Amino acid sequence: MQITLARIDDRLIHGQVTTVWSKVANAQRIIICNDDVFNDEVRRTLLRQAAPPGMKVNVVSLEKAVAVYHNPQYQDETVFYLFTNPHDVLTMVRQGVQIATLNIGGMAWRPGKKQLTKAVSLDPQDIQAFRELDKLGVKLDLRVVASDPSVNILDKINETAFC
C-alpha cells in the first residue's frame, strides 16, 4: 500500500472538507483505522455511504489495518488513512506501517482535554503520543484544511509548556 495522506480527524468523513482532502490525497481507498468505529453499525454505514465517487471506503480495526497493509495483494493501492487519535497512529507505525508525515486536522474537545488551538484539544497522553511519533521521525503537520499554513504541533505545544 502507498499512503498518500494520513490524517487525524475524529469527525472522519464530514462533507466538503473531507472531500477536498480526498482530492489532495488522490487515493483509491479511504481507510478508517479504529477499533471502536468498526463496531458501530450505524456509523460504519454512514461512512461507507459517504464514499466520494471513484473511491472506496473501509472501516477497520488496527489489527486489520496492519494486516492489509502487509498484504501484497494491495502493494500498489493508494490509501488515505483516517484516525481519531495519535495513539492509534503510533501503534500502527510501531508495527511497520510507514507514515512519513501525519496530518492533524481535528481532535475534539471533551472534559479532561485542554484546548491547544482551534480544532485541536489534548491531554498529556495525546501529547506523549506525538512526542513518540516525532522521535520515530514522523513529521507532524497540523492543518484543518489543506490551504491552511502547516503548523508543527509539537512546536505549538512547546510554546506554552516545558519539553
Tab-separated table of all heavy atoms in Angstrom, residues 25 54 58 110 113:
chain	number	residue	atom	x	y	z
A	25	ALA	N	-5.278	13.898	-1.508
A	25	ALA	CA	-4.695	12.575	-1.329
A	25	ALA	C	-4.645	11.769	-2.627
A	25	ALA	O	-3.724	10.976	-2.823
A	25	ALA	CB	-5.467	11.809	-0.270
A	54	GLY	N	-15.727	7.326	-7.167
A	54	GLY	CA	-14.466	6.775	-7.625
A	54	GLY	C	-13.576	6.240	-6.520
A	54	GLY	O	-12.536	5.656	-6.805
A	58	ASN	N	-13.296	1.910	3.644
A	58	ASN	CA	-13.290	0.766	4.538
A	58	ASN	C	-13.047	1.198	5.983
A	58	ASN	O	-12.271	2.111	6.244
A	58	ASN	CB	-12.235	-0.256	4.112
A	58	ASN	CG	-12.519	-0.846	2.756
A	58	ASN	OD1	-12.044	-0.339	1.754
A	58	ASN	ND2	-13.305	-1.911	2.717
A	110	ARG	N	-13.190	17.564	24.884
A	110	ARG	CA	-14.082	16.919	25.842
A	110	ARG	C	-13.474	17.143	27.250
A	110	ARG	O	-12.296	17.498	27.362
A	110	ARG	CB	-14.309	15.438	25.494
A	110	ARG	CG	-13.100	14.536	25.579
A	110	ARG	CD	-13.344	13.131	25.002
A	110	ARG	NE	-12.090	12.404	24.833
A	110	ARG	CZ	-11.781	11.668	23.773
A	110	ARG	NH1	-12.652	11.512	22.778
A	110	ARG	NH2	-10.604	11.062	23.718
A	113	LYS	N	-9.559	17.285	28.476
A	113	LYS	CA	-8.651	17.826	27.475
A	113	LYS	C	-8.453	19.314	27.729
A	113	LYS	O	-9.259	19.945	28.401
A	113	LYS	CB	-9.235	17.643	26.084
A	113	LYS	CG	-9.625	16.221	25.740
A	113	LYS	CD	-8.470	15.400	25.235
A	113	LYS	CE	-8.911	14.016	24.797
A	113	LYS	NZ	-7.756	13.078	24.628
